[PDB]
From a paper:
We show that the orthologue identified in [name] (AhlABC) is a haemolytic tripartite α-PFT, requiring all three components for maximal lysis, and we present the structures of the soluble forms of monomeric AhlB and tetrameric [name] and the decameric pore form of AhlB. [name] provides the initial single leaflet insertion, assembly with AhlB then producing an oligomeric hydrophobic pore, and finally recruitment of AhlA produces a hydrophilic fully active AhlABC pore. Structural and sequence analysis suggests this method of pore assembly may well occur throughout the tripartite α-PFT family.
Based on the length of the hydrophobic head of [name], its delineating charged residues and the observation that it is not lytic in isolation, we suggest that [name] inserts into a single leaflet of the bilayer. We thus constructed a triple leucine to threonine mutation (α3 L156T, and α4 L160T, L161T) of [name] to reduce the hydrophobicity of the head. Haemolytic assays using the triple mutant of [name] resulted in an almost 80% reduction in activity of the AhlABC complex. We also determined the structure of this triple mutant of [name], which showed it adopts the same tetrameric structure as that observed for the wild-type [name] (rmsd 0.6 Å) . In addition, the triple Leu–Thr head mutant of [name] designed to decrease its hydrophobicity, reduces lytic activity by 80%, emphasising the head’s critical role. Taken together, these results show that monomeric [name] is required for lysis, and that disassembly of the tetramer of [name] and the hydrophobic nature of the head of [name] are both vital for pore formation.
Author numbering:
A (entry chain J), D (entry chain J): 3 to 132, 134, 134A, 135 to 238, 243 to 270
B (entry chain D), C (entry chain D): 4 to 73, 77 to 232, 244 to 268
């Protein structure tokens, strides 16, 4: 249900489909290996990061409500010890999130470069199929001439037979030239179709990966805003501590929504 | 040869087609159909092709041997022998054509059904994206008010406390609506990927059917007809036998 | 700036959108809608943008002048003056947002209607292509028989005469079915081209709506609120005025 | 209704849509000029060719039925005069058809080359948008650091003010770097969208043009088969003349179907 959970599930499906393709060039094998490693190694690290962010947020949510339950004045030394403890507990979550985002952007950026490289290759197949289509057109014309001469020499008497015995050999050669070019055009059309199908799956994988990266990045941004609220208690009035605790609690609840397993 | 390439392209699309999970019945229908086409029908097309080529090579040599010999009840002892030897191949070819068209036609119907499903999913999003936009705009307004109130110092605390309650409600609404839109978008994307593969499979299957039809037409013509005409007869038949070898070739 | 680019991209799509003829009602609906958006609504978005920027530049200078002066019934003679001067721009912005969403939502509904029409056209072809394949296969068989009979010399004349009659009937059937399939394929192609342009127009319109919403949210916040807090107040307000200039910029 | 009529009508619509595009590169202007010339000059020559093929076929259809109405023997000199007259009447139609096909293939092949050139350009925009996205990502990180230092120095006392007056200038510069890159990414996305739309219309024009070329080519092939039947009368038995006249009449009726204004 949640955006991380969906992106992960969709990426796992795209990856299985991406592995089903054979006979593709090196850039396609580059993506196949990359997505295999993303599904095997990085998506488990994203699930670990999600579990750790939620565990962290649940603990800090109760710590903040307990601070906001304080009546009378905030003892300024109790504040600092708390701010220190929270700053120490944010550090590792903020770090794991930044690391998770970096690993994700690295892998996804390599997919985009391999996709662009495959696209250049697809355009060079379009160029290739357009000379093969001309060669095919011209071998058809060549076969039209030969068959009109066969008409003509078959139209002559005994005088024709020598010329016909010759033309028979040219006709076979030109026919094999036409049948070969039809096979070559069919071949390149199939390669074009297969690569377009593959790029459709790698583009979909990268779109889902992008949704995952944007949500990891949103989680990091909220952790940074949370850090800023908490440090505005350390800068110290008991009503200011209450303002920054209240702001920090909105950010903690934002994390719980953004990193949530299930939507709602 | 086109026939050999069509088979090969059909095998690759079938592996890719089987990789997709979580699709509706109509997609499962195509997955089963293409599994059977690859397991049962393509080997029979390969057998048909071997028999046609073997038969064509034997009849080619025989027609040349006839065009070489130097008898009105000889041209009938032969024509009867050809129409005999050509009967089993004529059968395999008609069966293969009928089975191919039947399987291909079901893919076409399932594909249309999946297109109808996709348009309905797109209509479902349009109905939701409106509400999501609204919720995202309120959430934008609330994030801005949060930064402002926090900047007002203690004067902003009653206002921030009240906003914290509304923020929770709007964040839950945006989360639910995003999750719902994202789910349907994921389904549409998967089905479009699957439809690209099933359309490609069907295009290749069309080429195979066309080639199987061209072969069965040449064979039917050789199997249904009965004295210097013998020469013109053998010359016409031999032109046909040669197109048969080309249409059903392994090139 | 995004707002200026969205407008420009909307103008190009609208010229391309008006170039299409022979489309159903739902396409005509979009053609009229986008004509009015370009003629009436985008000039108003351009007017809104000018007024927002002019208002933001004046209030920015005023907020700096307040942060510079070295009176509890002065902070109210001002706040009342801002909420006054901001009221007309707050109105134009809400109207522009409402008119934009209304026009964009109708494009979305017409687009879905055209997608439903396209899937039905695709279902019509599937029903016909089967019959066309059949007719094309008979025609192939008849063209082959024609070349063969003609090769038999005078023995082939009765057979060619009979085939000439059937050939005419099959050629007329293939011609009718091809023409029908080709007509529907042409319609699908034109509508897909039109849908590419209307989707693009709507994507650009979405960016404009988002930017108009971000502006109206910043303005609403400046227009609804009321002593060293004055300093924090002016500092917060001034951060807002500056985002307003960025969101509504011409860059 | 007929395939020539439909292809022409569809090409006229695609051409109007192709002319509506502005701000595209030289290869797009190459196609705009080409399709303008196809609609202005070549489609009228295709309509003339169609009218001339049908006029020719109607006259030859009646000439062949009148020959087949001959009873008793074909006077071998009457045959030759007829064969000569028909060969003289085919020559100009076979020529106009070949010319029409050549002009069509020339124009269409230039569309395909300009399309491939536009596709190479679209892939170079994909490469360009992927460096702009990184530059944008990095200027966002740069703006995150600056705002965390502003947090920090705002956190210091009077000691902070000098450093803050400096950072204020860096923050403006980095902000203008981010706003500029967002505008540049938006700009290239719009260019990509517009070019894809244009290529969709030029691909459709070329598909319809291809249907026209295949039908012109089919008309030329039938005229060539008709020529071969008619010359097999010139090679001369009254029953052989009847065989080749009957074969020729099937080809004449094929032209009337293939070049037909209305389908059926
Ligand atoms: Na794997
Ligand atoms: Na978050
Ligand atoms: Na023009
Ligand atoms: Na024709």
């Amino acid at each position: 249900n949640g955006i991380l959970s969906q992106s992960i599930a969709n990426m796992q499906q795209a990856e299985a489909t991406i592995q089903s393709f054979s006979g593709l060039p090196q850039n396609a094998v580059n993506i196949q290996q990359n997505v295999g490693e993303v599904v095997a190694a990085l998506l488990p690290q994203v699930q670990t990061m999600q579990q750790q962010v939620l565990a962290f947020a649940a603990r800090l949510e109760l710590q903040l409500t307990q601070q906001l339950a304080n009546t009378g004045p905030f003892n300024p030394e109790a504040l600092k010890a708390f701010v220190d403890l929270v700053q120490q507990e944010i550090a590792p979550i903020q770090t794991l999130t930044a690391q998770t985002l970096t690993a994700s952007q690295s892998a996804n950026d390599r997919i985009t470069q391999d996709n662009i490289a495959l696209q250049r290759i697809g355009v060079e197949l379009q160029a290739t199929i357009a000379g093969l289509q001309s060669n095919l057109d011209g071998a058809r014309q060549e076969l039209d001439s030969l068959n009109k001469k066969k008409l003509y020499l078959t139209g002559l008497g005994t005088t024709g037979l020598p010329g016909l015995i010759a033309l028979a050999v040219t006709l076979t050669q030109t026919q094999n030239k036409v049948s070969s070019l039809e096979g070559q055009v069919n071949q390149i059309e199939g390669q074009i179709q297969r690569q377009q199908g593959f790029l459709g799956q790698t583009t979909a994988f990268s779109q889902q990966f992008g949704s995952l990266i944007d949500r990891v990045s949103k989680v990091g941004n909220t952790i940074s805003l949370l850090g800023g609220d908490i440090a505005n208690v350390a800068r110290d009035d008991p009503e200011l501590a209450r303002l920054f605790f209240t702001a920090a609690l909105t950010e903690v609840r934002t994390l719980q929504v953004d990193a949530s397993h299930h939507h709602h």
